[PDB]
C-alpha cells in the first residue's frame, strides 16, 4: 500500500473509469491521489500478496470471496454510524457480515439474466429444452441460438442448480461444508444438458467470455447470458436487446448464484481512514454510483436512494427477478474451493475429457478437500495461466483397495527462465501423499501442527522435447511407484535423500535410472488445516551420481547437478536423454566431491564387497584382503569416516565375515586402544588411532597390492575371492 495515496482494485469488466472519475473528484477535494487498477485474476492476486505487504488499499469483488479473505486476516473491520447503515439495504449488509463483524461495504447486487436479440428472436424461450430446436431454426440462416462463457462456472451454475444442484446445504443459518450437492441427480441433469448441447453442436466448449460477447454484440448469436456490466457494450452495438428471466430447466427456474459487489479495506493499509472517507462519502453516494454506472452498469445498487431511481429500469427488474429465483452466494471461506471444483468439472465434462458423473464426483469430493485445495492454491499461484492442466486420475481410489496411492497427478507446462538459461519443461505435481481429505480415509488426522499425511507431495521436472504438444504420462507412473514404496514402508523422505532404482525411469534405454530428492525450487510449502505440506522434487541421476551421493551426501551432489545445466541446472530438470555423468562432463567436479568428503565426512557406513580377514577373541596380528573395488574405498573409510570419528563396515558378499574400522572414540566397540584388534566370531573390529590413520593414508598416497606395518598387513587382490 502507501500513505497519502489510495490504490483500488476492481475487475476489468466492471466500470473502472467511472470509479476513476470519482477518484479524481476525491483528489480534487482532499488532495489525495486515487489510483484505480484492474489486474487479471485480481481476487487471487489479492490473497497472494496481501500477506507480504503489497496489495490494494481497497479491493472490489463479489462477497463470496471476502469471508475467506477475512479468515486469513487480510481485511479490516468497517465501522459505519447507524446513519450510514440505514442508507443501504439490510440484506446487502448481510452479504458482507462474517463471524458477526462487517468486513466490507456492499456496493451492488449482481445477477445473471438472459439477454436476447429482439430482431433475431422477438419472443425469447422460457425453457432450455426449446433451444436445440431453436438453434436449428437459426443455423438455417447462418446464426446461432446461444453463446455464453463456458470457462467460468458462474455462468453454468444457474442451469446446474435448477433441478437440485447446490453448493452447501444451508439449514438453520449454518452451512454444512460436508454436505455438498454438485454430485446429485439435479446437478447431473443440468450439466448433462449443457454437455448434450455441445454434443449436438448447438454450442462449443471452447467458447469463453470474449467470444460470447463479440458474437452476440455483432449479431451472430440470438442470445447470451451475462450480468449488468455487459449492457453498456451492447448499447454501443447495432443490436437491439432485451433483458429477461433465464430459461427454466425441467420446469424449474434457473438459479443463478447472486453476488454482491463489495469493497473491502486491506488490513495492512496505512490509509484506512482515507479509505473509509472515500467509500462512505464519495463512492456510496448518488453521484459516485451514477459516475461508475454510466461507464458500466452495476446492477441493483445497495444505496436505497439511487436504487429507487434504478429499479424503474426494466433491465434491473429482470435482474432482480433472476436474483430472487436464484440464491445469494455464501461468503464462507469454502466458496473458492467450491468454485474451483465446479470450474474443472464443467470444463472437463464439456470438452469430453470426462463424463458428467465422473467430473461431478471429483468436484464433489474436491469441494470439501481442504488439503487438495490448499495445494491447488499454490499451483494456481505458479500457474495462473493454467486452470485445468492434463491430469492423471486414479480411477480406483487407494482407500477402496486401489493399487495407486496418488489420487491425482497434475501436469503443467513450465516456460522456464530465458534470462537464467532455464529450458521449458513439464512440471508434475502429485496428490495423495499428504492429507487431502482429512477424514481418515487414508491418513490419520493429526491437526494443523505437524505434517499433513507424510508431510510432502512429489513433483518432477522433465525437460520438454522439440514439438511436444502434451506432457508424457510415464512420470505419473513413476510417482505412483515411489508413492507405493512410501506407503508400504511407512518411510518418509527428506531433501537430500536418494532412491536406488536401477531401471530407466521412463522404461527406455536411458542412463537415468536413479533418483535424488530435493526441495522444489518454485513450490512454497503450504498450511493445511490437516497439517503442513512440503514439495519434494525428483531428480533423475546416473548410477555413478547416486554412488557419489552415497559416498558423500545428497545435498552436495544436487548442487553439482545445479552447476551442470545439462544435467539439471538451477531448477534440477531431468533430461532422460542425457548420456554423460556430471563427472564425464567436468572432472574437476570429482575433485569437489573429494573435498566435501574430507570436510563433511561421508554418509557411507559400510559396503558389500569382496574381502576377507560364540566368544570375543583378541588378536595382535591381523591380515585384511580386499578386492580392487573395495580396496578403492579404504581412503573413504579412513579420510571420510575414521577422521570424523565414524565407524565403517565391510561385509563379505559370501562370508559371514565382517571388518569394522573403528575410530578411537566411537562407542560400543569391543576393540580398545589396549586391544585394537578383536573379533566376535566372524565379525572383526579394529581400532585405529588418528595418527596411524593419517600415516596409513599417506602410505596409500595397482594389483597385486601388499601393505605392511608393525601391527598389521593389508592385501589388495583380484580373483582369490571366488
Ligand atoms: O467463475 C466462478 C466465479 O464466480 C463469481 O465470479 C463472478 C463475479 O462475481 C462477477 O462480478 C463477474 O466478475 O463474473 C465473475 C465470473 O467471471 C465469484 O464471485 C467468484 O468467486 C468465482 O471465482
XYZ file of C-alpha atoms and ligand atoms in Angstrom:
745
model
C 0.000 0.000 0.000
C 1.005 3.628 0.534
C 0.349 6.616 2.835
C -1.427 9.690 1.425
C -2.350 7.720 -1.686
C -5.214 5.340 -2.414
C -4.827 2.177 -4.513
C -8.003 0.399 -5.606
C -8.508 -2.979 -7.333
C -11.615 -3.792 -9.358
C -12.226 -6.375 -12.074
C -11.674 -5.212 -15.659
C -15.237 -5.996 -16.746
C -16.563 -3.521 -14.185
C -16.670 0.267 -14.612
C -13.170 1.191 -13.514
C -13.163 4.503 -15.407
C -16.219 5.860 -13.643
C -14.582 4.807 -10.408
C -11.503 6.702 -11.589
C -13.611 9.836 -12.086
C -14.833 9.509 -8.512
C -11.166 9.142 -7.596
C -10.490 12.376 -9.473
C -13.157 14.249 -7.533
C -11.687 12.852 -4.317
C -8.220 14.003 -5.381
C -9.657 17.451 -6.058
C -11.456 17.864 -2.728
C -8.839 16.231 -0.493
C -5.599 16.319 -2.489
C -5.062 12.580 -2.075
C -4.303 10.832 -5.363
C -6.578 7.902 -6.199
C -5.171 5.218 -8.494
C -7.514 2.586 -9.952
C -6.121 -0.659 -11.363
C -7.804 -3.742 -12.837
C -5.252 -6.599 -12.765
C -6.091 -10.022 -14.186
C -7.040 -12.677 -11.636
C -7.022 -9.916 -9.053
C -9.102 -11.703 -6.484
C -6.363 -14.391 -6.263
C -3.550 -11.921 -6.548
C -5.097 -10.278 -3.523
C -4.889 -13.250 -1.117
C -1.467 -13.990 -2.615
C 0.265 -10.664 -1.994
C -1.729 -9.204 0.846
C 0.409 -11.074 3.323
C 3.818 -9.927 2.058
C 2.609 -6.378 2.418
C 1.858 -5.356 -1.129
C -1.781 -5.063 -2.090
C -4.629 -2.623 -2.702
C -5.912 -0.309 -0.019
C -9.331 -1.340 -1.271
C -10.398 -4.472 -3.105
C -13.642 -4.806 -5.059
C -15.235 -8.207 -5.640
C -18.386 -10.251 -5.060
C -18.890 -11.033 -1.370
C -18.392 -14.800 -1.782
C -14.593 -14.394 -1.532
C -14.488 -11.918 1.355
C -15.288 -14.447 4.071
C -12.095 -16.248 3.129
C -10.074 -13.042 2.936
C -11.395 -12.254 6.417
C -10.494 -15.642 7.898
C -6.953 -15.179 6.607
C -6.878 -11.815 8.383
C -6.480 -9.722 5.249
C -9.466 -7.440 5.844
C -10.097 -4.570 8.243
C -13.419 -4.257 10.054
C -15.601 -1.480 8.729
C -17.357 0.917 11.081
C -20.388 2.827 9.816
C -22.561 5.027 12.003
C -26.177 3.875 12.025
C -26.723 6.912 9.871
C -24.862 5.128 7.098
C -26.085 1.575 7.663
C -29.638 2.807 7.125
C -28.675 4.246 3.729
C -28.050 0.704 2.467
C -30.425 -2.275 2.303
C -30.081 -4.633 5.297
C -29.564 -7.787 3.168
C -26.590 -6.259 1.372
C -25.062 -5.771 4.831
C -25.978 -9.417 5.442
C -23.892 -10.449 2.433
C -20.790 -8.804 3.938
C -21.118 -9.880 7.576
C -18.699 -12.638 8.618
C -18.379 -14.073 12.125
C -20.511 -11.234 13.455
C -18.366 -8.428 12.051
C -18.817 -6.277 8.928
C -15.869 -6.867 6.615
C -16.768 -4.815 3.543
C -19.023 -2.088 2.166
C -21.774 -3.571 -0.004
C -21.885 -1.767 -3.356
C -24.264 -3.508 -5.750
C -26.315 -6.621 -6.468
C -25.243 -8.696 -9.466
C -27.361 -11.426 -11.049
C -27.172 -13.092 -14.453
C -30.019 -12.617 -16.905
C -30.952 -13.942 -20.331
C -30.015 -11.278 -22.864
C -31.629 -11.704 -26.284
C -31.609 -10.028 -29.698
C -35.151 -8.720 -30.288
C -34.651 -8.609 -34.064
C -33.496 -12.228 -34.335
C -35.739 -13.509 -31.558
C -38.900 -11.445 -30.834
C -40.046 -13.750 -28.028
C -37.254 -15.492 -26.128
C -37.579 -19.078 -24.858
C -38.862 -19.718 -21.383
C -37.193 -23.108 -21.268
C -33.776 -24.621 -22.068
C -35.349 -27.583 -23.848
C -36.576 -25.406 -26.750
C -33.116 -24.116 -27.531
C -31.839 -27.130 -29.506
C -34.765 -26.805 -31.947
C -34.363 -23.048 -31.827
C -30.691 -23.234 -32.704
C -31.584 -25.425 -35.645
C -34.009 -22.808 -36.999
C -31.368 -20.089 -36.810
C -28.487 -22.220 -38.103
C -30.610 -22.335 -41.272
C -29.934 -18.633 -41.768
C -26.339 -18.606 -40.566
C -26.995 -17.721 -36.937
C -26.699 -19.488 -33.591
C -29.202 -19.511 -30.739
C -26.975 -19.226 -27.677
C -23.402 -18.377 -26.708
C -22.045 -17.618 -23.236
C -18.879 -18.037 -21.179
C -18.307 -21.746 -20.539
C -14.939 -21.226 -18.849
C -16.353 -19.856 -15.587
C -18.805 -21.973 -13.576
C -20.572 -18.747 -12.615
C -22.389 -18.838 -15.942
C -23.380 -22.506 -15.968
C -24.325 -22.694 -12.300
C -27.879 -21.388 -12.853
C -28.627 -24.396 -15.048
C -26.925 -26.845 -12.691
C -28.801 -25.642 -9.613
C -32.188 -25.580 -11.341
C -33.026 -29.254 -10.876
C -31.469 -29.648 -7.434
C -27.794 -28.722 -7.567
C -26.358 -26.754 -4.645
C -23.023 -25.812 -3.116
C -23.516 -26.312 0.608
C -26.723 -27.176 2.378
C -27.948 -24.271 4.436
C -30.188 -25.149 7.317
C -30.846 -23.022 10.368
C -28.342 -20.360 9.384
C -25.477 -22.792 9.153
C -23.822 -24.058 6.007
C -22.742 -27.660 6.228
C -19.439 -27.750 4.427
C -19.556 -31.550 4.379
C -22.942 -31.577 2.628
C -22.079 -30.609 -0.939
C -24.651 -31.005 -3.711
C -22.813 -30.859 -7.029
C -22.921 -34.630 -7.346
C -26.671 -35.188 -7.086
C -29.116 -36.058 -9.846
C -30.077 -32.405 -10.254
C -26.550 -31.199 -10.869
C -26.036 -34.175 -13.159
C -29.192 -33.236 -15.054
C -28.228 -29.626 -15.745
C -24.605 -30.347 -16.600
C -25.653 -33.293 -18.762
C -27.961 -30.933 -20.668
C -25.139 -28.448 -21.288
C -22.880 -31.265 -22.445
C -25.605 -32.518 -24.814
C -25.947 -29.032 -26.275
C -22.246 -29.186 -27.118
C -22.500 -32.744 -28.487
C -25.298 -31.725 -30.849
C -23.219 -28.749 -31.958
C -25.576 -26.109 -30.582
C -22.663 -24.772 -28.523
C -18.867 -25.012 -28.461
C -16.871 -25.986 -25.370
C -14.081 -23.544 -26.270
C -16.396 -20.519 -26.053
C -15.427 -18.004 -23.392
C -16.475 -14.558 -22.169
C -14.902 -12.594 -25.021
C -16.151 -14.846 -27.835
C -19.653 -14.812 -26.404
C -19.690 -11.026 -26.090
C -18.304 -10.498 -29.581
C -20.740 -12.983 -31.061
C -23.875 -11.517 -29.534
C -22.890 -7.896 -29.996
C -22.043 -8.394 -33.658
C -25.418 -10.091 -34.018
C -24.108 -13.567 -34.801
C -25.972 -15.284 -31.957
C -29.535 -14.771 -30.754
C -28.902 -14.998 -27.016
C -26.224 -14.784 -24.346
C -26.007 -14.913 -20.556
C -24.398 -12.126 -18.531
C -24.623 -9.504 -15.806
C -25.464 -5.769 -15.898
C -21.854 -4.729 -16.599
C -22.269 -6.120 -20.116
C -25.095 -3.862 -21.198
C -23.061 -0.795 -21.863
C -21.135 -2.593 -24.574
C -24.298 -3.948 -26.107
C -25.729 -0.438 -26.220
C -22.873 0.655 -28.456
C -23.556 -2.299 -30.739
C -26.117 -2.316 -33.526
C -28.131 -4.951 -31.678
C -31.486 -4.141 -30.112
C -31.540 -6.235 -26.964
C -33.806 -7.207 -24.107
C -33.004 -8.465 -20.618
C -35.293 -11.161 -19.242
C -35.728 -14.111 -16.906
C -33.460 -17.101 -17.506
C -34.958 -20.196 -19.124
C -36.392 -22.895 -16.884
C -34.894 -26.386 -16.812
C -37.177 -29.384 -16.308
C -39.924 -26.984 -15.266
C -37.905 -25.178 -12.626
C -36.233 -21.748 -12.572
C -32.551 -21.352 -13.303
C -30.913 -20.406 -10.029
C -28.004 -18.001 -10.570
C -25.621 -17.543 -7.652
C -26.253 -13.897 -6.850
C -23.223 -11.838 -5.919
C -22.928 -8.574 -4.047
C -20.190 -6.357 -5.409
C -18.418 -5.258 -2.248
C -15.413 -3.139 -1.271
C -13.024 -4.303 1.445
C -10.218 -2.473 3.214
C -6.767 -4.064 3.360
C -5.814 -4.845 6.961
C -2.241 -3.913 6.024
C -3.305 -0.488 4.759
C -1.955 2.706 6.330
C -4.730 4.848 4.983
C -7.705 3.017 6.367
C -9.471 6.201 7.388
C -8.878 7.685 3.959
C -10.449 4.540 2.540
C -13.481 4.940 4.800
C -13.850 8.571 3.713
C -13.731 7.661 0.023
C -16.155 4.729 0.142
C -18.736 6.166 2.549
C -18.735 9.785 1.403
C -17.692 9.618 -2.249
C -18.381 6.227 -3.821
C -21.530 5.277 -1.929
C -23.440 8.391 -2.958
C -25.989 9.023 -5.683
C -23.279 10.953 -7.509
C -20.498 8.380 -7.118
C -22.648 5.396 -8.032
C -24.032 7.225 -11.064
C -20.500 8.061 -12.206
C -19.493 4.392 -12.097
C -22.838 3.278 -13.506
C -22.530 5.370 -16.684
C -19.328 3.558 -17.520
C -20.622 0.032 -16.807
C -23.954 -0.700 -15.113
C -23.571 -2.043 -11.578
C -26.934 -3.773 -11.415
C -29.274 -3.273 -8.472
C -27.391 -0.978 -6.113
C -27.313 -1.163 -2.332
C -27.831 2.566 -1.802
C -31.589 2.953 -1.273
C -31.795 6.486 -2.681
C -30.154 5.667 -6.017
C -31.727 2.220 -6.314
C -35.206 3.750 -6.195
C -34.290 5.501 -9.440
C -32.747 2.383 -10.938
C -35.489 -0.050 -10.023
C -37.666 1.518 -12.697
C -35.352 0.226 -15.445
C -36.955 -2.944 -16.847
C -33.477 -4.459 -17.189
C -32.941 -4.037 -13.442
C -36.338 -5.561 -12.799
C -35.390 -8.664 -14.764
C -32.067 -8.619 -12.946
C -33.903 -8.808 -9.631
C -36.341 -11.480 -10.817
C -33.413 -13.725 -11.703
C -31.827 -12.709 -8.409
C -34.822 -13.736 -6.345
C -35.225 -17.076 -8.088
C -31.574 -17.803 -7.546
C -29.817 -17.813 -4.189
C -27.312 -15.329 -2.759
C -23.792 -16.742 -2.593
C -22.461 -17.877 0.767
C -19.436 -15.851 1.905
C -17.724 -18.652 3.842
C -14.078 -19.462 3.025
C -15.002 -22.761 1.347
C -16.608 -20.989 -1.617
C -13.338 -20.549 -3.531
C -12.668 -24.287 -3.312
C -16.228 -24.980 -4.419
C -15.903 -22.683 -7.439
C -12.650 -24.353 -8.472
C -14.119 -27.861 -8.214
C -17.081 -26.882 -10.368
C -14.934 -24.991 -12.889
C -12.851 -28.083 -13.542
C -15.956 -30.282 -13.641
C -17.786 -28.175 -16.236
C -14.749 -27.733 -18.498
C -13.782 -31.408 -18.446
C -17.382 -32.512 -18.964
C -17.885 -30.040 -21.819
C -14.603 -30.904 -23.569
C -15.137 -34.661 -23.296
C -12.122 -35.182 -21.041
C -14.513 -36.643 -18.502
C -18.089 -37.873 -18.155
C -20.607 -35.776 -16.261
C -20.775 -38.353 -13.451
C -17.010 -38.634 -13.033
C -16.329 -34.911 -13.273
C -19.049 -34.060 -10.777
C -17.986 -36.857 -8.434
C -14.480 -35.419 -8.440
C -15.834 -31.887 -7.909
C -17.985 -33.178 -5.071
C -15.057 -34.688 -3.242
C -12.789 -31.755 -4.099
C -15.254 -29.113 -2.950
C -14.563 -30.266 0.605
C -10.895 -31.274 0.493
C -9.001 -28.505 2.323
C -5.627 -30.145 1.668
C -6.161 -30.782 -2.010
C -7.447 -27.200 -2.179
C -4.575 -25.615 -0.249
C -2.156 -27.223 -2.695
C -4.259 -26.246 -5.716
C -3.818 -22.716 -4.346
C -0.036 -22.755 -4.671
C -0.375 -24.447 -8.039
C -2.696 -21.647 -9.031
C -0.174 -19.077 -7.862
C 2.592 -20.592 -10.021
C 0.378 -21.198 -12.984
C -2.336 -18.537 -13.125
C -2.296 -19.327 -16.823
C -3.396 -22.957 -16.413
C -6.667 -23.563 -14.551
C -7.060 -27.133 -15.875
C -3.865 -28.989 -16.801
C -3.883 -32.514 -18.139
C -4.335 -34.577 -15.003
C -3.936 -38.316 -14.412
C -6.629 -39.614 -12.066
C -6.541 -42.908 -10.182
C -9.966 -44.299 -11.074
C -9.912 -46.971 -8.398
C -9.107 -44.855 -5.355
C -6.457 -46.158 -2.971
C -8.764 -46.183 0.053
C -11.083 -48.570 -1.760
C -8.331 -51.129 -2.309
C -6.782 -49.441 -5.327
C -3.081 -50.004 -6.150
C -2.228 -46.345 -6.889
C -1.940 -44.179 -3.733
C -1.705 -40.937 -5.720
C -5.278 -39.770 -6.357
C -4.172 -37.151 -8.862
C -1.006 -36.163 -10.705
C -1.227 -32.774 -12.407
C 0.976 -31.999 -15.402
C 1.968 -28.406 -16.129
C 3.951 -26.709 -18.843
C 6.654 -24.593 -17.283
C 8.123 -21.943 -19.578
C 11.332 -21.585 -17.578
C 13.528 -18.502 -17.339
C 15.099 -17.301 -20.573
C 17.185 -14.884 -18.518
C 18.607 -17.716 -16.417
C 19.008 -20.137 -19.330
C 16.403 -22.493 -17.843
C 14.686 -24.620 -20.539
C 10.956 -25.290 -20.919
C 9.825 -28.409 -19.081
C 6.845 -30.331 -17.767
C 6.152 -29.998 -14.044
C 4.379 -32.942 -12.429
C 2.737 -32.469 -9.023
C 1.242 -35.391 -7.113
C -1.741 -35.633 -4.805
C -2.213 -38.218 -2.065
C 0.972 -38.336 -0.009
C -0.437 -35.510 2.082
C -3.801 -35.451 3.825
C -6.176 -34.241 1.107
C -9.482 -35.034 2.795
C -8.637 -35.174 6.500
C -11.424 -37.598 7.326
C -9.206 -40.624 7.994
C -9.930 -42.417 4.728
C -6.163 -42.714 4.067
C -4.184 -40.798 6.649
C -4.846 -40.314 10.310
C -5.822 -36.756 11.063
C -3.175 -35.073 13.150
C -4.134 -31.389 13.339
C -2.694 -28.177 11.917
C 0.675 -28.532 13.658
C 2.852 -31.296 12.265
C 2.903 -32.901 8.793
C -0.210 -33.376 6.711
C -0.068 -37.075 5.882
C 3.561 -37.930 5.169
C 4.165 -34.191 5.106
C 5.004 -33.897 1.448
C 3.930 -34.385 -2.124
C 6.126 -35.397 -5.060
C 6.998 -33.199 -8.011
C 9.086 -33.771 -11.135
C 10.607 -31.682 -13.918
C 11.025 -33.349 -17.304
C 12.865 -31.395 -19.978
C 10.404 -30.751 -22.793
C 11.366 -32.234 -26.166
C 11.102 -30.483 -29.556
C 7.479 -30.338 -30.729
C 5.984 -31.972 -27.651
C 2.404 -30.687 -27.607
C 1.499 -32.577 -24.440
C 3.393 -33.890 -21.404
C 4.078 -37.632 -21.408
C 2.393 -39.642 -18.650
C 5.160 -42.047 -17.604
C 6.346 -39.713 -14.837
C 2.990 -40.205 -13.154
C 3.501 -43.982 -13.113
C 6.959 -43.413 -11.673
C 5.455 -41.236 -8.981
C 2.946 -43.997 -8.229
C 5.871 -46.384 -7.763
C 7.607 -44.127 -5.262
C 4.327 -43.384 -3.537
C 3.766 -47.094 -3.009
C 7.230 -47.506 -1.556
C 6.468 -44.740 0.954
C 3.053 -46.193 1.813
C 4.217 -49.782 2.318
C 7.489 -48.984 4.065
C 5.897 -46.131 6.015
C 9.178 -44.416 5.224
C 9.384 -40.653 4.733
C 11.833 -38.734 2.605
C 13.743 -35.530 3.197
C 15.568 -33.146 0.912
C 18.878 -34.869 0.271
C 17.721 -38.482 0.436
C 18.410 -40.771 -2.504
C 16.376 -43.532 -4.079
C 18.033 -46.534 -5.682
C 16.076 -47.764 -8.638
C 18.467 -49.155 -11.264
C 15.901 -49.108 -14.066
C 15.390 -46.440 -16.694
C 12.855 -44.101 -15.114
C 10.947 -43.926 -18.373
C 11.251 -47.582 -19.296
C 13.527 -46.752 -22.174
C 17.250 -47.384 -22.619
C 18.198 -44.161 -20.840
C 21.128 -43.821 -18.480
C 18.930 -42.097 -15.904
C 17.915 -44.963 -13.595
C 18.049 -43.475 -10.091
C 16.619 -40.581 -8.129
C 17.659 -37.890 -5.677
C 15.183 -35.766 -3.746
C 15.354 -32.022 -3.222
C 13.068 -29.134 -2.228
C 11.073 -27.968 -5.235
C 12.707 -24.718 -6.408
C 9.398 -22.924 -7.072
C 6.689 -24.586 -4.911
C 6.397 -22.971 -1.474
C 5.177 -25.181 1.385
C 1.536 -24.730 2.406
C -0.528 -24.576 5.591
C -3.189 -27.278 5.516
C -5.744 -27.495 8.338
C -4.707 -31.115 8.362
C -1.042 -30.117 8.563
C 1.853 -28.611 6.629
C 2.872 -29.831 3.168
C 6.270 -29.515 1.507
C 7.138 -30.485 -2.059
C 9.950 -32.923 -2.845
C 11.165 -32.777 -6.434
C 12.530 -35.963 -8.023
C 15.822 -35.607 -9.874
C 16.917 -38.310 -12.293
C 20.544 -39.354 -11.908
C 23.025 -41.846 -13.349
C 24.235 -44.775 -11.336
C 27.545 -43.045 -10.843
C 25.909 -39.892 -9.451
C 23.859 -41.929 -6.989
C 27.063 -43.564 -5.860
C 28.661 -40.192 -5.332
C 25.677 -39.243 -3.258
C 26.006 -42.272 -1.018
C 29.722 -41.735 -0.580
C 29.421 -38.077 0.233
C 25.940 -36.644 0.649
C 22.861 -35.975 -1.438
C 22.946 -32.291 -0.935
C 26.373 -31.768 -2.390
C 25.648 -33.802 -5.472
C 22.414 -31.933 -6.075
C 24.366 -28.676 -6.087
C 26.862 -30.196 -8.542
C 23.822 -31.004 -10.678
C 22.693 -27.395 -10.420
C 26.013 -26.181 -11.826
C 25.804 -28.553 -14.820
C 22.722 -27.183 -16.576
C 22.555 -30.098 -18.991
C 22.186 -32.469 -16.067
C 19.629 -30.436 -14.108
C 20.654 -26.835 -13.652
C 19.248 -24.326 -11.138
C 15.828 -25.991 -11.068
C 17.206 -29.524 -11.408
C 15.386 -30.522 -14.599
C 15.727 -34.167 -15.555
C 16.795 -34.933 -19.095
C 16.201 -38.607 -19.824
C 18.325 -38.203 -22.939
C 21.453 -37.217 -21.072
C 24.316 -39.528 -21.991
C 27.163 -38.419 -19.726
C 27.639 -38.173 -15.966
C 28.445 -34.777 -14.484
C 31.942 -36.176 -13.941
C 32.439 -37.083 -17.585
C 31.258 -33.544 -18.355
C 33.577 -31.861 -15.847
C 36.189 -33.966 -13.970
C 37.025 -31.049 -11.648
C 33.648 -31.926 -10.139
C 35.075 -35.189 -8.798
C 37.662 -33.041 -7.077
C 34.856 -31.048 -5.422
C 33.331 -34.281 -4.125
C 36.625 -35.401 -2.589
C 36.992 -32.061 -0.816
C 33.469 -32.486 0.535
C 34.042 -35.990 1.851
C 37.183 -34.685 3.567
C 35.430 -31.775 5.247
C 31.962 -33.322 5.742
C 32.741 -36.992 6.103
C 30.792 -39.458 4.048
C 27.392 -40.908 4.579
C 28.540 -44.393 3.613
C 28.565 -46.598 6.699
C 29.513 -49.863 5.010
C 29.701 -51.797 1.771
C 29.004 -55.285 0.495
C 32.302 -56.288 -1.070
C 34.783 -58.997 -1.967
C 37.017 -59.073 1.116
C 38.315 -61.181 3.981
C 40.304 -61.216 7.205
C 30.486 -67.534 20.472
C 33.463 -65.823 22.078
C 35.084 -62.410 21.778
C 38.648 -63.279 20.729
C 41.617 -60.872 20.761
C 44.367 -60.669 18.167
C 47.704 -58.877 17.984
C 48.105 -59.556 14.268
C 45.523 -59.017 11.529
C 45.668 -59.515 7.762
C 42.940 -57.994 5.608
C 42.240 -58.923 1.991
C 40.399 -56.681 -0.453
C 39.093 -56.595 -3.962
C 40.269 -53.638 -6.048
C 36.786 -52.350 -5.832
C 36.573 -52.458 -2.038
C 40.234 -51.539 -1.776
C 39.222 -48.356 -3.554
C 37.044 -47.329 -0.605
C 39.747 -47.549 2.066
C 40.688 -43.867 1.742
C 36.954 -43.115 2.081
C 36.834 -45.400 5.110
C 39.690 -43.513 6.775
C 39.532 -39.973 5.403
C 35.752 -39.973 5.138
C 34.826 -41.780 8.348
C 37.558 -42.502 10.928
C 38.886 -38.918 10.789
C 35.315 -37.907 11.636
C 35.082 -40.447 14.465
C 32.774 -42.544 12.313
C 32.950 -46.331 12.039
C 32.917 -48.235 8.757
C 31.892 -51.807 7.918
C 32.923 -54.099 5.072
C 30.808 -57.243 4.846
C 31.914 -60.132 2.679
C 29.399 -60.892 -0.006
C 29.799 -64.575 0.614
C 31.240 -64.847 4.040
C 29.660 -64.254 7.346
C 32.807 -62.236 7.769
C 32.878 -58.524 8.537
C 35.519 -55.869 9.169
C 34.548 -52.759 11.082
C 37.065 -49.936 11.197
C 36.627 -48.080 14.420
C 37.918 -44.634 15.301
C 39.287 -44.040 18.728
C 36.304 -42.503 20.495
C 33.479 -44.435 18.853
C 31.102 -46.005 21.354
C 30.241 -49.651 21.923
C 33.185 -51.295 20.188
C 34.854 -54.303 21.797
C 38.169 -53.059 20.455
C 40.226 -50.941 22.812
C 43.403 -48.983 22.336
C 44.892 -51.593 24.631
C 43.499 -54.285 22.342
C 42.768 -52.678 18.983
C 42.163 -55.877 17.017
C 39.335 -58.001 18.390
C 36.721 -60.310 16.885
C 33.372 -61.827 17.827
C 33.084 -64.905 15.640
C 33.420 -63.768 12.029
C 32.976 -60.132 12.915
C 36.136 -58.149 13.288
C 36.614 -54.726 14.755
C 39.919 -52.889 14.517
C 40.584 -49.559 16.215
C 42.972 -47.125 14.576
C 44.328 -44.082 16.343
C 44.159 -40.954 14.277
C 47.868 -40.544 13.773
C 48.251 -44.033 12.461
C 45.281 -43.448 10.218
C 46.950 -40.441 8.635
C 50.131 -42.399 8.157
C 48.219 -45.181 6.527
C 46.593 -42.722 4.185
C 49.937 -41.287 3.121
C 51.153 -44.792 2.530
C 48.207 -45.238 0.220
C 49.070 -41.887 -1.365
C 47.716 -51.281 -8.749
C 47.461 -55.043 -8.427
C 48.500 -57.050 -6.670
C 48.924 -54.624 -3.757
C 50.539 -55.507 -0.408
C 50.941 -53.262 2.637
C 52.651 -53.871 5.963
C 53.064 -52.033 9.246
C 54.420 -53.129 12.584
C 50.920 -54.128 13.699
C 49.061 -55.449 10.657
C 49.031 -56.411 6.988
C 46.737 -55.383 4.129
C 46.370 -57.100 0.737
C 44.670 -55.871 -2.438
C 43.878 -58.667 -4.869
C 41.681 -59.617 -7.848
C 40.379 -63.193 -8.132
C 41.236 -65.021 -4.890
C 37.744 -64.186 -3.856
C 35.594 -66.775 -5.621
O -16.240 -18.426 -12.057
C -16.566 -18.536 -10.691
C -16.561 -17.149 -10.060
O -17.898 -16.723 -9.920
C -18.010 -15.428 -9.378
O -17.264 -14.519 -10.150
C -18.016 -13.614 -10.924
C -18.162 -12.274 -10.209
O -18.958 -12.407 -9.053
C -18.816 -11.250 -11.125
O -18.707 -9.972 -10.543
C -18.166 -11.229 -12.505
O -16.862 -10.703 -12.400
O -18.113 -12.534 -13.044
C -17.332 -13.416 -12.269
C -17.153 -14.731 -13.018
O -16.466 -14.480 -14.225
C -17.481 -15.435 -7.956
O -17.616 -14.151 -7.384
C -16.024 -15.873 -7.946
O -15.606 -16.054 -6.613
C -15.861 -17.186 -8.705
O -14.490 -17.455 -8.903
